[PDB]
Scaffold this active site. Structure first.
Site, PDB file in Angstrom:
ATOM      1  N   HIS A  69     -17.931   2.503 -20.440  1.00 29.58           N
ATOM      2  CA  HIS A  69     -18.652   3.333 -19.454  1.00 29.58           C
ATOM      3  C   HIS A  69     -19.872   3.352 -19.748  1.00 29.58           C
ATOM      4  O   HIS A  69     -20.398   3.413 -21.234  1.00 29.58           O
ATOM      5  CB  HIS A  69     -18.368   4.576 -20.415  1.00 29.58           C
ATOM      6  N   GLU A  72     -23.052   5.729 -21.016  1.00 29.00           N
ATOM      7  CA  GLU A  72     -22.958   4.921 -22.527  1.00 29.00           C
ATOM      8  C   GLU A  72     -23.922   4.107 -23.445  1.00 29.00           C
ATOM      9  O   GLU A  72     -23.656   3.619 -24.121  1.00 29.00           O
ATOM     10  CB  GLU A  72     -21.683   5.170 -23.448  1.00 29.00           C
ATOM     11  N   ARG A 127     -19.893   6.369 -14.701  1.00 29.30           N
ATOM     12  CA  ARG A 127     -19.291   6.342 -16.167  1.00 29.30           C
ATOM     13  C   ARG A 127     -18.421   4.722 -15.222  1.00 29.30           C
ATOM     14  O   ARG A 127     -18.115   3.719 -16.431  1.00 29.30           O
ATOM     15  CB  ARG A 127     -18.252   7.652 -16.492  1.00 29.30           C
ATOM     16  N   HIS A 196     -17.453   3.023 -28.099  1.00 27.67           N
ATOM     17  CA  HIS A 196     -18.151   4.662 -27.003  1.00 27.67           C
ATOM     18  C   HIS A 196     -19.677   5.624 -27.013  1.00 27.67           C
ATOM     19  O   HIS A 196     -19.663   5.105 -28.403  1.00 27.67           O
ATOM     20  CB  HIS A 196     -16.587   5.366 -26.351  1.00 27.67           C
ATOM     21  N   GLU A 270     -16.901   6.654 -31.373  1.00 30.02           N
ATOM     22  CA  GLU A 270     -18.232   7.777 -30.620  1.00 30.02           C
ATOM     23  C   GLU A 270     -19.448   7.203 -31.129  1.00 30.02           C
ATOM     24  O   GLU A 270     -19.092   8.151 -31.949  1.00 30.02           O
ATOM     25  CB  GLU A 270     -17.222   8.206 -30.643  1.00 30.02           C
TER      26      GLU A 270
HETATM   27  C1  LIG Z   1     -18.524  12.350 -24.023  1.00 26.58           C
HETATM   28  C2  LIG Z   1     -16.850  11.177 -25.617  1.00 26.58           C
HETATM   29  C3  LIG Z   1     -15.921  11.990 -25.521  1.00 26.58           C
HETATM   30  C4  LIG Z   1     -17.080  10.218 -23.763  1.00 26.58           C
HETATM   31  N1  LIG Z   1     -16.086  10.978 -22.352  1.00 26.58           N
HETATM   32  C5  LIG Z   1     -17.010  11.288 -21.645  1.00 26.58           C
HETATM   33  O1  LIG Z   1     -17.907  10.405 -21.158  1.00 26.58           O
HETATM   34  C6  LIG Z   1     -15.523  12.353 -20.673  1.00 26.58           C
HETATM   35  C7  LIG Z   1     -14.716  11.991 -19.576  1.00 26.58           C
HETATM   36  C8  LIG Z   1     -14.007  13.334 -19.759  1.00 26.58           C
HETATM   37  C9  LIG Z   1     -14.358  13.088 -17.698  1.00 26.58           C
HETATM   38  C10 LIG Z   1     -13.805  14.057 -17.454  1.00 26.58           C
HETATM   39  C11 LIG Z   1     -12.382  14.910 -18.157  1.00 26.58           C
HETATM   40  C12 LIG Z   1     -11.941  14.400 -19.403  1.00 26.58           C
HETATM   41  C13 LIG Z   1     -13.540  13.521 -19.674  1.00 26.58           C
HETATM   42  N2  LIG Z   1     -16.819  12.921 -20.159  1.00 26.58           N
HETATM   43  C14 LIG Z   1     -17.012  13.816 -20.580  1.00 26.58           C
HETATM   44  O2  LIG Z   1     -18.204  15.032 -19.971  1.00 26.58           O
HETATM   45  O3  LIG Z   1     -17.449  14.641 -21.674  1.00 26.58           O
HETATM   46  C15 LIG Z   1     -17.099  16.025 -22.451  1.00 26.58           C
HETATM   47  C16 LIG Z   1     -17.166  15.733 -23.642  1.00 26.58           C
HETATM   48  C17 LIG Z   1     -17.234  15.831 -25.044  1.00 26.58           C
HETATM   49  C18 LIG Z   1     -16.770  15.661 -26.081  1.00 26.58           C
HETATM   50  C19 LIG Z   1     -15.327  16.699 -26.158  1.00 26.58           C
HETATM   51  C20 LIG Z   1     -14.945  17.234 -25.502  1.00 26.58           C
HETATM   52  C21 LIG Z   1     -15.463  16.678 -23.746  1.00 26.58           C
HETATM   53  P1  LIG Z   1     -15.633   9.221 -24.248  1.00 26.58           P
HETATM   54  O4  LIG Z   1     -15.828   7.945 -22.587  1.00 26.58           O
HETATM   55  O5  LIG Z   1     -16.902   8.432 -24.927  1.00 26.58           O
HETATM   56  O6  LIG Z   1     -14.411   8.987 -24.392  1.00 26.58           O
HETATM   57  C22 LIG Z   1     -13.787   8.458 -24.575  1.00 26.58           C
HETATM   58  C23 LIG Z   1     -11.883   8.473 -25.973  1.00 26.58           C
HETATM   59  C24 LIG Z   1     -11.359   7.490 -25.833  1.00 26.58           C
HETATM   60  C25 LIG Z   1     -11.404   7.003 -26.662  1.00 26.58           C
HETATM   61  C26 LIG Z   1     -10.512   5.613 -26.661  1.00 26.58           C
HETATM   62  C27 LIG Z   1      -9.298   5.939 -25.927  1.00 26.58           C
HETATM   63  C28 LIG Z   1      -8.917   7.037 -25.357  1.00 26.58           C
HETATM   64  C29 LIG Z   1     -10.356   7.821 -25.414  1.00 26.58           C
HETATM   65  C30 LIG Z   1     -13.062   8.199 -23.199  1.00 26.58           C
HETATM   66  O7  LIG Z   1     -12.754   9.432 -22.735  1.00 26.58           O
HETATM   67  O8  LIG Z   1     -12.126   7.013 -22.337  1.00 26.58           O
HETATM   68 ZN   LIG Z   2     -16.420   6.317 -23.178  1.00 26.99          ZN
END
Ligand SMILES: CC(C)[C@H](NC(=O)[C@H](Cc1ccccc1)NC(=O)OCc1ccccc1)P(=O)(O)O[C@@H](Cc1ccccc1)C(=O)O
Ligand SMILES: [Zn+2]
EC number: 3.4.17.1
Length: 307
Positions: A69, A72, A127, A196, A270
């Site tokens: 992503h 990050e 992203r 991440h 994370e």
């Molecule tokens: C902020 C942080 C949680 C990163 N997530 C993002 O960057 C997310 C993407 C997103 C957008 C819209 C709707 C849902 C998700 N966007 C975002 O704005 O994060 C907000 C958030 C933070 C904390 C808790 C809840 C929500 P990350 O990309 O590191 O999270 C991983 C989690 C993950 C890891 C491993 C496997 C699956 C998922 C991912 O989403 O791919």
């Molecule tokens: Zn990520």
């Protein structure tokens, strides 16, 4: 920057800078590290993986990727520090020496180079990849919703305009397919780590189902130990647990795919912080983040060596 010894680890770098650094680390440590090109990105950039090895032939191996992503930035900055760290500690650190004397480590610092370059040129908070969906004006696919583990299921979106768009089919993104082909071909990966930010969480499978993994008891105990080692340095607190339970539902994530290929020690970190700066973490926090995360990563590799 005339050596990896004078490179400035305490600041964020550009793509040209990180690619040149990989060339210099290989020139300085020719018996330990080599640079592999495992694919090309959607707009034609090489995708490189650094291989750290003491020798052997197809040894058990550990995968680590960072930057899937692109916004990050602390993850690519942590990966550059890891790469130097590896060449500083082999020999000096007794358990790290013992890991690399039995296993290889593959490190992919920029898993999404087109997105990365785009964050430096036009949108710091980009992203996704830069695949062009000619159906839309919205560009890119979330590469962490593109793996073939619960693909298309709740936890990802079918709109090209979503930040979570999964793509038209699993592995459609070349930067996901490149890892998938390489890992499958190698066939001897023991651990798969994908880093991440932000949130300070240690996550294990699954994200696309609430069902527990068969090895939940063991992975929960490794995560518990890894999070304790990490907090030992500067007091940073991490929570840990399965993806769906600890951050949110997510389908097509890379750790769920690797676990389903039989790679038991599949974990996503994370990194810092918990939202105060979010993706725009101050550069004065790069080295403390990298240092305590190393302690967490080293703990998992130890566990992988040992069984
Ligand atoms: C902020 C942080 C949680 C990163 N997530 C993002 O960057 C997310 C993407 C997103 C957008 C819209 C709707 C849902 C998700 N966007 C975002 O704005 O994060 C907000 C958030 C933070 C904390 C808790 C809840 C929500 P990350 O990309 O590191 O999270 C991983 C989690 C993950 C890891 C491993 C496997 C699956 C998922 C991912 O989403 O791919
Ligand atoms: Zn990520």
């Amino acid at each position: 920057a005339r050596s990896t010894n004078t490179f400035n680890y305490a600041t964020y770098h550009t793509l040209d800078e990180i690619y040149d650094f990989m060339d210099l680390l290989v020139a300085q440590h020719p018996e330990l590290v080599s640079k592999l090109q495992i694919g090309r990105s959607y707009e034609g950039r090489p995708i490189y993986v650094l291989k750290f090895s003491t020798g052997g032939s197809n040894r058990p191996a550990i995968w680590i990727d960072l930057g899937i992503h692109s916004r990050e930035w602390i993850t690519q900055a942590t990966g550059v520090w890891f790469a130097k760290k590896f060449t500083e500690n082999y020999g000096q650190n007794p358990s790290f020496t013992a890991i690399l004397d039995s296993m290889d480590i593959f490190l992919e610092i920029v898993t999404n180079p087109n997105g990365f370059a785009f964050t430096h040129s036009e949108n710091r908070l980009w992203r996704k990849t830069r695949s062009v969906t000619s159906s839309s004006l919205c560009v890119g696919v979330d590469a962490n919703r593109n793996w073939d583990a619960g693909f298309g299921k709740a936890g990802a979106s079918s709109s090209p305009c979503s930040e979570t768009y999964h793509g038209k089919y699993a592995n459609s993104e070349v930067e996901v397919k490149s890892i998938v082909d390489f890992v499958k071909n190698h066939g001897n990966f023991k651990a798969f780590l994908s880093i991440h930010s932000y949130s300070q969480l240690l996550l294990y499978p699954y994200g696309y189902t609430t069902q527990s993994i068969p090895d939940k008891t063991e992975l929960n105990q490794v995560a518990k130990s890894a999070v304790a080692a990490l907090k030992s340095l500067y007091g940073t607190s991490y929570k840990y647990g399965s993806i769906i339970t600890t951050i949110y539902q997510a389908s097509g994530g890379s750790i769920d795919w690797s676990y389903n290929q039989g790679i038991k020690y599949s974990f996503t970190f994370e990194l810092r912080d918990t939202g105060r700066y979010g993706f725009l973490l101050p550069a004065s926090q790069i080295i403390p983040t990298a240092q305590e995360t190393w302690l967490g990563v080293l703990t998992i590799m130890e566990h992988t060596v040992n069984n």
